[PDB]
């Protein structure tokens, strides 16, 4: 069965992102052809992670998401050993060499406060938390939004464009009521 959401994801995100998203889903035992809403969500989260790491200086961010589980933890161990930072309980998404902290990126369809709470309660104190929403809201640990305003604004704009493209295809309602 070929869903509209699967075909939309493929023409909406660039192929490297789609490829990385497909391998992650299969690595954790889910099918992009069936779990099509989560397919879209993982592509979205991946692109946000990459845009975020592009927002700093040259060697500011180490990218943890988008790797297979073993090498992602391998990079975490190396980061932890040369900087002396506690090994996080769960895999984070980036590491900030400038502020010397792991970052967990969040992309939510619901209101921001709730997701931050669930993410904070679930995650480990040292890891910095940065949530984006499809409505333009954001929340970061200690109100410290790591990047400058233009880089985060660009992430916000893209997320709202994605929402519009789905709404134009009558796929937004199913996506919001799927998280």
Ligand X SMILES: O=C(NCCc1ccccc1)c1nc([C@@H]2CCCN2C(=O)COc2ccccc2Cl)[nH]c(=O)c1O
Catalytic residues: 119
x/- letters, 41..70, toward Mn ion (CB under 5 A): ------------------------x-----
Is residue 112 near ligand X by the rule CB under 6 A? no
80, 91, 112, 123: which one binds ligand X (CB under 6 A): 91
Is residue 1 near ligand X by the rule CB under 6 A? no
Shortest distance, position 84 Cβ to ligand X, whole Å: 24
Pick from 36, 52, 157, 169: which is nearest to 104 by CA?
52
Is residue 106 near ligand X by the rule CB under 6 A? yes
Alpha-carbon separation of residue 103 from 20, 50, 120 (angstroms): 20, 13, 12
Structural tokens at position 130: 């940065």
Q: Are 49 and 66 in contact (CB under 8 A)?
A: yes
Shortest distance, position 168 Cβ to ligand X, whole Å: 25
Which H or E run contains 46? Answer: helix 36-53
105, 129, 159, 166: which one binds Mn ion (CB under 5 A): 105
- Burial (Cβ within 10 Å: 0-12, 13-18, ≥19) of residue 27: exposed
Residue positions forming the annotated binding site for Mn(2+): 45, 65, 93, 104-105
């Amino acid at each position: 069965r070929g869903s509209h959401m699967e075909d939309f994801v493929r023409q909406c995100f660039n192929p490297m992102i789609v490829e990385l998203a497909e391998k992650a889903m299969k690595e954790y035992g889910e099918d992009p052809k069936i779990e099509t809403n989560k397919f879209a969500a993982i592509c979205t989260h991946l692109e946000v992670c990459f845009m975020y790491s592009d927002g700093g200086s040259k060697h500011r961010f180490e990218i943890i998401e988008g790797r297979d589980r073993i090498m992602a933890w391998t990079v975490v161990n190396s980061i932890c050993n040369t900087t002396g930072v506690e090994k996080p309980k769960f895999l984070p998404d980036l590491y900030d060499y400038k502020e010397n902290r792991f970052i967990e990126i969040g992309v939510t369809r619901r209101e921001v406060h709730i997701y931050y709470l669930e993410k904070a309660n679930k995650i480990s104190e040292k890891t910095h938390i940065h949530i984006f929403s499809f409505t333009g809201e954001e929340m970061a640990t200690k109100a410290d939004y790591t990047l400058d305003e233009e880089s985060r604004a660009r992430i916000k704009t893209r997320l709202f464009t994605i929402r519009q493209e789905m709404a134009s295809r009558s796929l937004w309602d199913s996506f919001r009521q799927s998280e």
